[PDB]
Ligand binder design. Structure first.
Ligand SMILES: [Zn+2]
Ligand SMILES: [Zn+2]
Ligand SMILES: [Zn+2]
Lengths: 199, 234, 127, 160, 190, 199
């Protein structure tokens, strides 16, 4: 409790990124021109949910290795308190030790968001049966998030970095099976006393 | 001092038996203003510490209506209706469950009356100062004052003369205090810088009842003052 | 030097003429009739109407420039940039329909923006 | 007064002079200001969104309506999203809803695609076109009704 | 009491913010559409609990630096009990709610949140919550009575801790990350 | 779930290759000079959609073989969910197990993308009636993709390799009828354990 761990995560997009719009009004205002809007701010900067990807990466790898980890992804699957994922990212009772920020872009949507044509091609006709537009993030875009850890344990940085290698392999955001979301991660970690902000 | 108070953050004043009153009473107004005069070391503080002073009469905050007039109480009910315009009550209380704590709070945005009366020149400067303070930086009534519940800024401030009710046929605007009364009126008197708390429970008469009484007790005043009972010309 | 020439060509591509900054007249009914006739024989197509509205929203000068670019009969080839008409036509009717497209677009150039927008949604609803 | 809104970071050193290839725009105003492309993209989008700112009943049986909408909900032409969209249109008048069924049922001249969802099953092409037609008649007759009956009839098929 | 400090705290959201809607009738009226409505006034402005957040910030920070600060059952002798109140004695820092400057229709947006299966990579659960957008400036007027010398420093220290951790709810998903601007003053005279 | 198939795909062009720009802004900036630009990164590297090519290949061969394999090529056609290509590439309720990356080139546009002049010749006059200029990827250009199969079965390597041989036959990208897109694939497969990243 006397120490917090800051993990500054910077992320460079290698293959183009899609993360869909969640806001109903912003998506519907974008439905006139775009069928798949990207998740933007009101300050015109792309946001990407990061805590779910880290938690999913850690639960897949820790279930494969053979720890007593649960799966908070089934329909009515209550997360327990007796995990290392449930200690880091939370449960129904005790809150998450790791606060994971959104992956907010360093550039605006004029620079990194591009409206895109996607197709569905008939197999025998070999012609475009369907066409739609979706917004995608350009490659080389830099996204910044910070993960704080209250009461750090020793293996927390290794677990976060292992989840980041899993997200580097698999992807972040949407359209992951069709090539989208392949990213690279860089970690700058530091330990700060919780009294860092006191004078 | 006639005025209009607008609530931007709602208020929660409780009563016994699990009821919460519709309107903020003048006892809450008084307690807030006496705290505020304490915080500014105004010369009248000691008098707001006294529960007997009747020179300054902080009446009850009554909900003003679309009419623009003051809603008036209705006997044997829990609501007030502008005699001028067909009701305030049992639809602005809102049930709040917050991190365990369950209570009730009257919704914000409604406009209420800020009608105090000052019978001496000893305070016009003092009240002026309190309304000026209530103007620039607001006043707070009810529970959770330090959590921001009960925000109440002025909307109108007029120093307009007042005259007693030249009628012995008077309707109780608020809960008067009588020795053999039926409605138990409960209020409290804290003492800051002394750490003293007390719950003043006294019997009395309820609002919205016509009283055929030749006393007339100055202007309203039923017997407590400092809020308590008021009257209107029928 | 090569990347400088490519970038400098990309620069002037931008800020061309006066973006977002001497015309015939014909009735509104005539304009709907001519655009409706040239929609169905594939001269004023949906791409043509789209780039009409894009060059119109940057001003009247850009729209006159684009229309004189499409209608320009190149003296080397004798080919205007319009989409060729669909159906049986002789040459004189083909140039007369091209001149009709010229006059119709240059006459809607003089109209205001909400009298153009409302004339090109019923041909291009994704203007 | 020449104000540099180019980032003065990331600048190389050549011939004992620091240097950075720039590529942007000069803006007259008191100031001769140096802006990058992002600024011109923002100004281009602001002026483009300043130019786009100026942008201005075969009634059959009730039982027919229910039976038709049951079939089209089962064969997947009239789905939950289309029912919700039709309800929002009918909730903004009937003429709007006229325009909405006209937009969905509009066969494109070039492609021959109607914006309905292809029927799930093994129907023939003439059957598919007649199924789009009876979707049109069923919805278009439901516009002729009033708000209470349209509400109770669509909530059986879209609970929202 | 002759001196009183009014700390004027403005806020602009940097991440989308969620604080839960607290009143049962308006929650149930909004629960037909929104599973997590945001805290709103009857005048359609977002209300944010601010006292408890500043209090919590002081308790973790002064527990870390080693001060005898109670963990919230107060103590009455700690300086967080002097600032935000013990059970017997009231608080010197009367903290206002962080009211929005704009209206619900301009700053509150309904939105979709998911729960994703970890072997099928598909959406198992779907729900809707209302959130406050970024750039929505909010104001509050923290009142400290009987001002001690290190009150503004403690308040700004807590304010930087809120910028570090967030305010409202869903703080571990990234919500509530805000930036703070303070202008102080003193109050005396008529 | 304790193992993952990783297919490293190294593709080399035997014919000129064209796939098209899909971002409206880059297409507009390129259509002042080039009527048909290649799909490029913002890091100036060519992208080639890969999941649709493999999926289309597998549905054509598995429909010719006679298996109960659905067609997702028709207009807004819903995948069945009970076939081989629904397990590998995806269905409505289940994401595809084969996360197929984009075909990122090893080189950059100034080394592989060459502008090109195409013609349309009148059949009576033998004169160039029309011409246009399209960008095109050269022959010998090398592209790298990674297919990441989660919870693998036995046949997945054979299915992906057969689909790659079909793409070698028929082509990838656009303009396949006039001779574009003829490539060769080299496959380096490897079974990894899902807990590899955990330290
Ligand atoms: Zn668990
Ligand atoms: Zn304490
Ligand atoms: Zn299938």
């Amino acid at each position: 409790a006397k120490t917090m761990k800051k993990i500054y995560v910077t992320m460079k997009t290698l293959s183009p990124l899609y993360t869909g719009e969640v806001r109903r009004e912003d998506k519907e205002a974008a439905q006139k021109r775009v069928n798949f809007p990207v998740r933007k701010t009101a300050t015109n900067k792309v946001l990407i949910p990061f805590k779910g990807a880290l938690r999913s990466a850690l639960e897949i790898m820790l279930k494969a290795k053979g720890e007593n980890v649960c799966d908070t992804g089934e329909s009515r699957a209550r997360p327990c308190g007796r995990c290392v994922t449930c200690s880091l990212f939370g449960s129904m009772g005790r809150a998450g030790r790791a606060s994971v920020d959104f992956l907010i872009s360093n550039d605006t949507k004029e620079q990194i968001v591009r409206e895109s044509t996607h197709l569905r091609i008939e197999r025998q006709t070999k012609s475009a049966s369907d066409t739609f537009k979706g917004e995608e993030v350009i490659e080389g875009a830099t996204f910044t998030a910070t993960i704080t850890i209250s009461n750090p344990q020793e293996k927390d940085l290794s677990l976060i970095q292992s989840a980041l290698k899993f997200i580097e392999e698999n992807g972040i955001g949407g359209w992951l099976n069709k090539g989208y979301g392949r990213v690279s991660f860089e970690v700058k970690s530091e330990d700060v006393a919780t009294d860092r902000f006191l004078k | 001092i006639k005025g209009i108070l607008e609530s931007i953050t709602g208020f929660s004043i409780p009563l016994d038996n699990g009821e919460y009153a519709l309107y903020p009473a003048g006892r809450h107004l008084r307690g807030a203003i006496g705290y505020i005069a304490f915080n500014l070391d105004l010369p009248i503080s000691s008098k707001f510490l006294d529960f007997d002073f009747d020179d300054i009469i902080f009446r009850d905050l009554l909900p003003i209506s679309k009419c623009g007039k003051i809603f008036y109480p209705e006997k044997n009910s829990n609501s007030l209706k502008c005699p001028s315009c067909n009701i305030y009550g049992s639809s602005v209380l809102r049930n709040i469950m917050a991190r365990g704590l369950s209570y009730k709070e009257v919704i914000e945005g409604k406009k209420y009356r800020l009608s105090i009366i000052v019978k001496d020149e000893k305070y016009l400067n003092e009240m002026e100062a309190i309304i000026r303070y209530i103007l620039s930086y607001g006043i707070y009534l009810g529970n959770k004052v330090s959590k921001g519940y009960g925000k109440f800024k002025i909307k109108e401030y007029s120093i307009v003369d007042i005259l007693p009710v030249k009628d012995s046929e008077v309707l109780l605007l608020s809960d008067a205090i009588i020795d053999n009364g039926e409605k138990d009126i409960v209020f409290s008197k804290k003492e800051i810088s002394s750490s003293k708390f007390e719950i003043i429970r006294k019997r009395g008469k309820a609002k919205g009842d016509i009283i055929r009484d030749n006393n007339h007790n100055g202007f309203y005043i039923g017997y407590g003052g400092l809020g308590f009972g008021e009257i209107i010309s029928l | 030097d090569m990347i400088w020439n490519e970038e400098y060509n990309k620069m002037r591509s931008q800020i061309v003429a006066e973006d977002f900054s001497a015309l015939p007249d014909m009735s509104h009914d005539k304009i709907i009739e001519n655009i409706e006739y040239l929609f169905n024989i594939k001269i004023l197509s949906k791409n043509r109407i789209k780039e009409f509205w894009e060059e119109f929203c940057k001003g009247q000068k850009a729209a006159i420039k684009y229309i004189t670019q499409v209608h320009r009969k190149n003296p080397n080839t004798g080919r205007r940039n319009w989409n060729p008409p669909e159906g049986d036509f002789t040459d004189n009717e083909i140039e007369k329909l091209y001149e009709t497209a010229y006059n119709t677009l240059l006459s809607l150039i003089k109209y205001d923006k909400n009298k153009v927008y409302n004339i090109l949604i019923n041909f291009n609803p994704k203007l | 007064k020449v104000v540099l809104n180019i980032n003065t970071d990331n600048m190389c050193n050549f011939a004992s002079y620091r240097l950075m290839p720039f590529s942007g725009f000069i803006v007259e105003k008191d100031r001769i200001e140096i802006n990058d492309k992002n600024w011109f993209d923002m100004i281009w989008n602001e002026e483009y969104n300043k130019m786009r700112s100026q942008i201005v009943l075969p009634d059959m049986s009730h039982d027919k309506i229910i039976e038709n909408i049951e079939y089209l909900f089962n064969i997947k032409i009239l789905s939950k999203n289309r029912i919700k969209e039709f309800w929002e249109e009918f909730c903004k008048g009937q003429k709007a809803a006229i325009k909405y069924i006209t937009q969905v049922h509009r066969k494109n001249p070039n492609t021959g695609r109607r914006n309905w969802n292809p029927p799930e099953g093994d129907f023939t092409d003439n059957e598919i076109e007649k199924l789009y037609e009876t979707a049109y008649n069923t919805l278009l007759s439901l516009i002729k009704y009033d708000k209470n009956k349209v509400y109770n009839i669509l909530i059986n098929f879209n609970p929202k």
